[PDB]
Amino acid sequence: KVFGRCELAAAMKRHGLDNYRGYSLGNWVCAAKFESNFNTQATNRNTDGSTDYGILQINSRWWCNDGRTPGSRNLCNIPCSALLSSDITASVNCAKKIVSDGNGMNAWVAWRNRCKGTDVQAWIRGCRL
């Protein structure tokens, strides 16, 4: 499913991402926009052989298992296909683990290069939530 900005902001809030680990909602929404264009089915293959899955583009080398990434650690103990679902629960739940990593949202290159230090509040403005 392809989410709307406000549609996604509310689903993330409801799933407990607003200010999770100190990152306000606009950060999570900004990240998803640049990571998957709000599309839950997005996948992107990496040079090292791993693939990124879903709305938050979670990587198959550490977080999920896609059965084709040797040295996969599957930290969120879930098959990667579970992250492509129209229900963002598994992505949100695994994302909470990644952000708790000790590296924050820097784990998402699109967040680091395009969201970090911008008025991220602009991403939820006008949304009911």
Swiss-Prot record:
Question: Which positions form S-S bridges?
Answer: C6-C127, C30-C115, C64-C80, C76-C94
InterPro entries attached to this UniProt entry: Glyco_hydro_22, Glyco_hydro_22_CS, Glyco_hydro_22_lys, Lysozyme-like_dom_sf
**Where expressed (tissues)?**
In the egg white and polymorphonuclear leukocytes.
- Where does the C-type lysozyme domain lie? 1-129
Q: What is its main location?
A: secreted
Q: Which Gene3D superfamilies match?
A: 1.10.530.10
Task: Name the source's superkingdom.
Answer: Eukaryota
Biological process (GO) annotations? cell wall macromolecule catabolic process; defense response to bacterium; defense response to Gram-negative bacterium; defense response to Gram-positive bacterium; killing of cells of another organism
Q: Which key words are in the record?
A: Allergen, Antimicrobial, Bacteriolytic enzyme, Disulfide bond, Glycosidase, Hydrolase, Secreted, Signal
The subcellular location is:
Secreted
SUPFAM superfamilies membership: Lysozyme-like
Which EC numbers characterise this protein's activity in its record? 3.2.1.17
Catalysed reactions listed for this entry: Hydrolysis of (1->4)-beta-linkages between N-acetylmuramic acid and N-acetyl-D-glucosamine residues in a peptidoglycan and between N-acetyl-D-glucosamine residues in chitodextrins
The residues that hold substrate are: D101
Q: Could you tell me which PROSITE patterns the record lists for this protein? A: GLYCOSYL_HYDROL_F22_1 (PS00128), GLYCOSYL_HYDROL_F22_2 (PS51348)
Q: Which GO terms describe its cellular component?
A: cytoplasm; endoplasmic reticulum; extracellular space
Q: Is Ubl conjugation tagged as a keyword?
A: no
Q: Which GO terms describe its molecular function?
A: beta-N-acetylglucosaminidase activity; identical protein binding; lysozyme activity
Cite the active-site annotation: E35, D52
Annotated transmembrane regions: none
Q: What does this protein do?
A: Lysozymes have primarily a bacteriolytic function; those in tissues and body fluids are associated with the monocyte-macrophage system and enhance the activity of immunoagents. Has bacteriolytic activity against M.luteus.
Q: How does it assemble?
A: Monomer.
Similarity annotation = Belongs to the glycosyl hydrolase 22 family.
Misc = Lysozyme C is capable of both hydrolysis and transglycosylation; it also shows a slight esterase activity. It acts rapidly on both peptide-substituted and unsubstituted peptidoglycan, and slowly on chitin oligosaccharides.
Q: Which PANTHER family match?
A: LYSOZYME C
Q: What is this protein called?
A: Lysozyme C
Give the originating organism: Gallus gallus (Chicken)
Q: Per UniProt, what is the name of the gene that codes for the protein in this document?
A: LYZ
